[PDB]
Design a protein around this ligand. Structure first.
Ligand SMILES: Nc1nc2c(ncn2[C@@H]2O[C@H](COP(=O)(O)OP(=O)(O)O)[C@@H](O)[C@H]2O)c(=O)[nH]1
Length: 684
């Protein structure tokens, strides 16, 4: 019979065509909705359509079934593609045949395996061509994750090194991150992740069938990052007691987290955080083919049970009583994927927000799920998934009540805190920051904003607030350099033409990005502050390194809160600010000419800003397109104040194009300090 000796998958051509060149190392990895090539090597009889009939059968999942789309059998139609799964002969030479297979744009995602059934006469021999991986295609016009443009496809599906935005609203810091979705073994890790969710354990066949929908895959991926408690990827922790594992700030790449999760069976990786969850989810989604970007919202009202009215009761000193209340997060990071939604009303296609951080649900504290960004913009809270929570995270209202010792309460005019004021992501192509707050909220004070609030029953906050002549804000003169003492001003501007005798309550506390305040690092209690008519007074507060050294969080955030209170019945004024203390810059240099499969040396240096010595200095670099594993060096000698630490590392780049070298510094006193540098690998 027509027996075959070997089947030659064209790894190079398929990888180049389907943009899966990095993934096509040893196994074929193609994208649905596109024709991929294949080669058959028959020894002597070659192939004749007259008597030889080939019918491919492709199998997926532990419970295949034709009606569910997992299993598909299709003949060798030489003329055209008459259906979803088709195979046509494109070239026929001596001893060899070529094939151009095609997959439906709505095929399930996962590990498929082929089977040739060569039926010549009565001899229907059954073969096994091999396995391959099917991923979401952003290039197929009929696919649900199709992107019209090309730069967006490169940035969101093929770029494996990006920026996570942190710090404060007034000072955005672009911390580098190495997604590495195309790293060695990452795709298998993502498949195992998709093969261990509770839905798969409940009904494997239904899960495999429903993997075709990108929204379901997004839900499964986001829910298995942290939300799953049994064998989730990470284990959240917020108190600064990460000694049992790796601190959240220490992570520089999701590849390490995924490899640690896979190696230790499936146990939770130690002490991740919200932006870590977003980075891991973005890595998994990008590996699976879904165009995903990490989006950070500053002053987010996360974990408020979707409440649109947040009331904070404070004391006469401005300190928030009632510890049961949840603080306003300085920033919250969630992913945003590109999908088309048939399950919703027409027009709700495009960017969909996934939040892998479990909020406080009324049932079980689950994740959020894909809500259209346009749905949040128009306030369509009635969508399928958790629209109200994401809407509250960007459109909440905060009321700061002051409860004095007399038992009475007053409303403080807090004009500084705006929920969801700055939403940022990485720009397409360049390294700049793209401020996408306009796609989540309508412009303030506009008719569209009013109608969106009316559709969301949220028009309560639109009402005008107090308009007293007193005005006040927290001002910063120079850059916030960590490890040095500084002064932060409280600016009072008066235009009422009325002399005021008020008392001011400066207080600075080390705070994490969750809003968990720590011990005070400086205070100032002015009791007879005088404000002249049409005057403008700046009251400085001195913050000392010896004060915030002990309790500073690893995110280098300090909250300065000041309260201007008049003894008379008139209301109270409040002003808060978040200061990001800048870590010292990591100077990265590359010596030699960057060439593929050639030795490279990276000269990394840092200058210690602290007045004391760092003991356990440790550099760690990672790059998806530069190295196959993290390069870690430990300096065995402490570096004194002002002294400069300097190390050299060896790299063996293996991929072309542009790459980012993510560098992390970890010492006993200077915490995780990040750095990056773009390198272009030469053709050689
Ligand atoms: N590192 C750091 N720099 C800051 C921060 N806030 C402000 N700055 C610096 O202050 C400058 C802007 O000053 P600005 O805040 O507008 O002054 P203000 O309007 O009087 O409060 C920028 O160049 C920043 O470098 C912060 O939290 N961290």
């Amino acid at each position: 019979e027509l027996v075959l000796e070997r089947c030659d998958l064209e790894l190079e051509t398929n990888g180049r065509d389907h943009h899966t060149a990095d993934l096509c190392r040893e196994k074929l990895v193609v994208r649905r909705g596109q024709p991929f090539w294949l080669t058959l090597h028959f020894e002597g009889r070659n192939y004749e359509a007259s008597v030889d009939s080939l019918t491919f059968s492709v199998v997926t999942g532990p419970a295949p079934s034709q009606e569910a789309g997992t299993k598909a059998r299709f003949p060798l139609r030489d003329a055209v593609e008459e259906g979803d799964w088709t195979a046509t002969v494109v070239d026929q030479q001596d001893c060899t045949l070529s094939l151009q297979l095609t997959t439906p744009a709505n095929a399930p995602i996962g590990l498929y395996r082929l089977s040739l059934e060569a039926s010549t006469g009565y001899q229907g021999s059954s073969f096994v061509l091999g396995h391959f991986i099917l991923l979401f295609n952003a290039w197929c016009p009929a696919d649900a994750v199709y992107l019209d443009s090309e730069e967006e496809r490169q940035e969101y599906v093929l770029t494996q090194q990006g920026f996570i935005y942190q710090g404060s609203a007034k000072f955005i810091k672009n911390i580098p991150w190495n997604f590495g979705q195309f790293e060695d073994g990452i795709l298998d890790i993502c498949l195992i992740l998709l093969d261990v969710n509770p839905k798969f354990l409940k009904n494997a066949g239904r899960d495999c069938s429903r993997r075709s929908s990108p929204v379901y895959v997004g839900r499964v991926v986001s829910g298995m990052v942290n939300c799953n408690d049994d064998q989730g990827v990470l284990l959240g922790r917020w108190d600064n007691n990460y000694g049992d594992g790796v601190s959240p700030m220490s992570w520089i790449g999701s590849v390490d987290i995924l490899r640690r999760w896979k190696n230790h069976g499936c146990q939770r990786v130690k002490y991740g955080q919200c932006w870590v969850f977003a980075a891991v989810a973005c890595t998994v989604l990008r590996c699976l083919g879904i165009p995903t970007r990490v989006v950070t919202n500053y002053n987010s009202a996360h974990d408020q049970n979707s409440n649109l009215l947040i009331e904070y009761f404070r004391n006469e000193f401005g300190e928030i009583q009632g510890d049961k209340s949840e603080m306003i997060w300085n920033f919250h990071c969630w992913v945003e994927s590109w999908m088309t939604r048939p399950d919703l009303q027409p027009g709700y296609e495009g960017w969909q927000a996934l939040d892998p951080t479990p909020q406080e649900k009324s049932e079980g504290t689950y994740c959020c799920g894909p809500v259209p960004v346009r749905a949040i913009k128009e306030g369509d809270l009635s969508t399928k998934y958790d629209a109200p929570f994401v809407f509250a995270e960007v459109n909440a209202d905060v009321v700061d009540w002051i409860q004095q010792d007399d038992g009475s309460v007053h409303k403080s005019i807090n004009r500084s805190l705006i929920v969801g004021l700055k939403i940022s992501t990485k720009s397409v192509g360049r390294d700049e920051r793209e401020d996408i707050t306009h796609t989540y909220k309508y412009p303030e004070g506009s008719s569209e904003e009013r109608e969106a609030f009316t559709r969301a029953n949220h028009l309560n906050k639109l009402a005008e607030k107090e308009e007293t002549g007193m005005a006040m804000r927290i001002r910063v003169g120079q850059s916030m350099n960590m490890g040095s003492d500084f002064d932060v001003f409280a600016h009072i501007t008066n235009n009422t033409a009325e002399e005021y005798v008020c008392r001011l309550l400066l207080c600075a506390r080390t705070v994490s990005y969750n809003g968990i305040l720590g011990p005070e690092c400086g205070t100032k209690y002015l009791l007879n502050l005088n404000l002249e008519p049409f005057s403008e007074k700046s009251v400085p507060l001195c913050i000392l390194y010896e004060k915030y050294r002990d309790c500073l969080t690893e995110s280098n955030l300090i909250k300065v809160r000041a309260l201007l209170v008049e003894p008379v019945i008139n209301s109270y004024l409040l002003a808060e600010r978040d200061l990001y203390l800048e870590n010292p810059e990591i100077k990265i240099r590359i010596l030699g000419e960057p060439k593929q499969k050639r030795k490279l040396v990276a000269e990394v240096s840092l200058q210690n800003p602290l007045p004391v010595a760092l003991e356990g200095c440790t550099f760690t670099v990672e790059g998806a397109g530069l190295t196959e594993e993290q390069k870690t060096v430990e300096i065995p000698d402490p570096v004194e104040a002002g002294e400069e630490v300097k190390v050299r590392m060896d790299l063996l780049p293996l991929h072309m194009g542009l790459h980012k070298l993510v560098v992390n510094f970890e010492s006993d006193k200077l915490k995780a300090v990040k750095g990056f540098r773009n390198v272009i690998i030469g053709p050689a």
